[PDB]
Amino acid sequence: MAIIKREWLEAATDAHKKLGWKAKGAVVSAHDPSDTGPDAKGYASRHGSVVKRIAEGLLMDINEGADWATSLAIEDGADHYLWDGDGVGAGLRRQTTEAFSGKKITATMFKGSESPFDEDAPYQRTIGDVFRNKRAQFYYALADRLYLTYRAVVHGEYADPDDMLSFDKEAIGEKMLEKLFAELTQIQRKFNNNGKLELMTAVEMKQKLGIPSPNLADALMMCMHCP
Ligand SMILES: [Ca+2]
């Protein structure tokens, strides 16, 4: 039921160096504020198709976490910032916009439970027929990028860099990259009574499988959406 193969993540590591292309596009950052539990907060940032930062936020309350992540977004030169607003982050817009005062950085609340972005467009049968919600939509955007990258790196099959995803291992750091990978391979499909793609929530993953909230993975997933 897992949607991402570890082998794709290994292939995607420094894929831009292996295949000889460079980061191009906007810088997109996202923050997962976790919940009211012990689990670490998450932050991810990419420049176009190259991921450059994966960070954990420890021993922070909700507001400290938002200060931490918005400051990272500024440090990373983000053009766009998103954060998970489905839970405890629902009230963070004011603080987030304050943090970005006087800077050209957009702030977008991401709610994974919403119907998919652009749900009436054809799937490439509509996007809304295929994905239950934005959480599924953008995790599969991530999975699709990773698979194309795997096929390019390992099977020599051409793909547009814009449709791939590379992890800049030197920029990210081995330890955090490994933490991210360990979470990504745990993201799982759940049964859906309308035949749509749907993923387990963190709460469900905790209950069935006893694994902590994958907040690095979720942060990376959210930065797949560029406002
Ligand atoms: Ca989340």
Distance 83 CA to ligand 1 centre (A): 9
Could you tell me the residue range of the domain that residue 48 belongs to?
1-227
Three-class SS state of 43 = strand
CA torsion angle 87 93 96 100 (round to 10): 150
Distance 160 CA to ligand 1 centre (A): 29
Integer CA distances (angstroms), 59 to 40, 74, 87, 92, 134, in order: 8, 21, 18, 18, 29
Task: Answer yes or no: are the C-beta atoms of 166 and 14 closer than 8 Å.
Answer: yes
Task: Answer yes or no: are the C-beta atoms of 201 and 188 closer than 8 Å.
Answer: no
CA-nearest of 64, 47, 126, 145 to 99 is: 64
Separation of alpha carbons 138 and 161, rounded Å: 18
Distance 155 CA to ligand 1 centre (A): 33
Separation of alpha carbons 193 and 137, rounded Å: 17
Q: How many domains is the chain built from?
A: 1
Please indicate if the annotation marks 32 as binding a ligand.
yes
Cα Rg for the chain, rounded, in angstroms?
A: 17
Distance 191 CA to ligand 1 centre (A): 19
Separation of alpha carbons 207 and 24, rounded Å: 40
DSSP type of residue 94? H
The experimental method, as deposited, was X-ray
Separation of alpha carbons 103 and 220, rounded Å: 23
CA-nearest of 141, 147, 212, 223 to 183 is: 212
Distance 158 CA to ligand 1 centre (A): 33
Task: Answer yes or no: are the C-beta atoms of 18 and 38 closer than 8 Å.
Answer: no
With tokens 């450059």, the residue in question is: 52
Separation of alpha carbons 58 and 142, rounded Å: 25
Task: Answer yes or no: are the C-beta atoms of 180 and 216 closer than 8 Å.
Answer: yes
Question: Which residues, 6+ apart, have CB-to-CB distance to 122 below 8 Å?
Answer: none
CATH code of the domain covering residue 151? 3.30.420.240
Q: Which H helix or E strand runs over 118?
A: none
Give the β-pairing of 41-47 and 27-32: antiparallel
Question: Resolution of the coordinates in A?
Answer: 1.6
Sign of CA dihedral 15, 175, 188, 57: negative
